Ligand binder design. Structure first.
Ligand SMILES: *Nc1ncnc2c1ncn2[C@@H]1O[C@H](COP(=O)(O)OP(=O)(O)OC[C@@H](O)[C@@H](O)[C@@H](O)Cn2c3nc(=O)[nH]c(=O)c-3nc3cc(C)c(C)cc32)[C@@H](O)[C@H]1O
Length: 451
């Protein structure tokens, strides 16, 4: 129980009621430093621990696909927490009102939340701070090394973040203690889902035949389903991961991102299990570079760059290059709706958008190709960022995520990249040509599957 995982958000006066874990990013009962820390605080105070989750007003900015995935997982989570004699309360509203009122109504003694570097979570925290007088902590339960510990600043390249992160892995990569149950026991989610689906339905993604686009059987939600996906990745896909991770015709990725995004599985758990696996060397190195270095540098990016979703956060070499080509004539301009419908003149791009539309998880390789063409076929880099973020957040199961803003910023603005050869329109941003993908994998097979 390393105290470097927890820090104070606001001092206060400790009450004598239960310890409240405001769960947000880490929707799981196992392998959860925020829940474990909350339980430990409760034990020292001779009080029970309680979990609260905010069903916020912002769900209408995404789709049924993410709402159902999240809420079905929370239904499973209710059962698991109740087995530990830990009650869970699901508050309909936004956190500033709901958390403050709950703290008062339930005589909470201490408030704890998990860590997200996203603007909306920081918006939420500000309102909560103004409505409570009890101590308020946050625990990094999402990263192996706490984000504010891995580095003191924005890291401009993987190769400057990687040695700092790896220097800290011996301390922070460790097993989880078991969650001790509470000593004694202190509108349903199905109805909430019903109400939300009703409100979301007019905006549901449909084919011209009015049949829905989304296929919900590619990733079953919840902690138990996530563990099976991790186990099948290690048993069946990890050996080939190094060779096949850049081939979107092969189903050889871990497929863990939807579970990692909602915190239905701990990435620390995944890393421990992968470290212990005997697998092809090269493959384990490649996978750990993604789930450790690239995932946690995305939290580094959002945490230390307030404007992480804007042009101003790009590196200076990229801002200069993009500005110098701002007035170049674009080969094409597509509207947000033309991008959304997969109606560019590039069949590889359109197939990547159809994979996103139908499965809610675009292959990692084509996400890079996809975002870079939005830069190439939009009026400005600012508009490209707007369009890519809109589509990523609306349709990825793993979207609205530091990985997303960081991966889009890499794609369009060269964040965590270097300058490449100068081209018109896109400047020195790394280019990914259609013909280059053809030399890389079977583009025709990918197009057939998603068309
Ligand atoms: N590139 C990258 N950046 C951050 N974190 C990453 C990245 N690649 C992998 N990971 C993290 O590692 C695990 C395991 O990786 P894989 O098994 O290789 O991948 P999957 O879980 O099956 O597939 C998800 C993966 O394709 C994406 O994580 C990346 O493409 C990154 N990425 C997002 N990741 C998100 O979680 N949410 C988003 O909204 C993302 N949006 C984008 C947008 C764009 C334009 C790009 C280029 C990437 C991207 C992964 O689960 C992850 O934790």
């Amino acid at each position: 129980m390393n105290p470097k995982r927890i820090r104070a958000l606001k001092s206060g006066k400790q009450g004598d009621g239960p310890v409240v874990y405001w769960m947000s990013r880490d929707q799981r009962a196992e392998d959860n430093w925020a829940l474990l820390f909350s339980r430990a605080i409760a034990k020292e105070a001779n009080v029970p621990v309680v979990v609260v989750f905010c069903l916020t007003d912002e769900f209408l900015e995404a789709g049924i696909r993410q709402y159902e995935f999240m809420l079905k997982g929370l239904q499973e989570l209710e059962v698991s927490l109740s087995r530990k004699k830990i009650p869970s309360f699901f508050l309909r509203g936004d956190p500033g009102e709901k958390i403050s009122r709950f703290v008062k109504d339930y005589n909470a003694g201490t408030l704890v939340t998990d860590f997200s570097p996203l603007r909306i979570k920081n918006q939420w925290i500000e309102k909560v701070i103004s409505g409570i007088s009890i101590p308020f902590f946050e625990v990094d339960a999402h990263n192996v090394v706490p984000c504010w510990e891995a580095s003191q600043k924005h890291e401009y390249a993987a190769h400057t973040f990687r040695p700092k992160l790896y220097a800290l892995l011996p301390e922070f990569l460790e097993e989880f203690p078991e969650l001790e149950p509470n000593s004694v026991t202190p509108e349903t989610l199905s109805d909430v889902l019903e109400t939300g689906v009703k409100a979301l339905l007019p905006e549901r993604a449909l084919l011209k035949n009015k049949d829905p686009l989304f296929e919900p059987w590619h990733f079953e939600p919840g902690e138990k389903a996530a563990k099976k996906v991790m186990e099948s990745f290690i048993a069946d896909r990890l050996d080939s991961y190094g060779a096949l991770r850049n081939d979107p015709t092969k189903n050889m990725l871990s497929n863990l991102s939807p579970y990692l995004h909602f915190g239905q599985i701990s990435s620390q758990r995944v890393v421990l299990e992968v470290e212990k696996a005997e697998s092809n060397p090269g493959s384990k190195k490649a996978f750990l570079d993604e789930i450790l270095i690239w995932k946690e540098i995305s939290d580094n990016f959002c945490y230390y760059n307030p404007g992480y979703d804007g042009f101003e956060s790009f590196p200076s070499w990229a801002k200069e290059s993009l500005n110098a080509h701002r007035n170049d004539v674009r080969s094409h301009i597509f509207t947000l709706e033309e991008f959304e419908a997969g109606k560019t003149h590039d069949p590889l791009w359109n197939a990547s958008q159809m994979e996103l539309l139908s499965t809610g998880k675009m292959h990692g390789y084509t996400r890079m190709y996809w975002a870079k063409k939005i830069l190439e076929w939009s009026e400005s880099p600012e508009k490209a960022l707007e369009i890519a973020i809109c589509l990523n957040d609306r349709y990825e199961l793993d979207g609205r995520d530091p990985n997303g803003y960081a991966g889009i910023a890499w794609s369009i603005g060269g964040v965590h990249d270097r300058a490449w050869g100068e081209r018109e329109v896109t400047g020195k941003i790394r280019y990914m040509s259609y013909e280059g993908c053809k030399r890389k994998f079977d583009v025709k097979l990918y197009i057939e599957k998603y068309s």
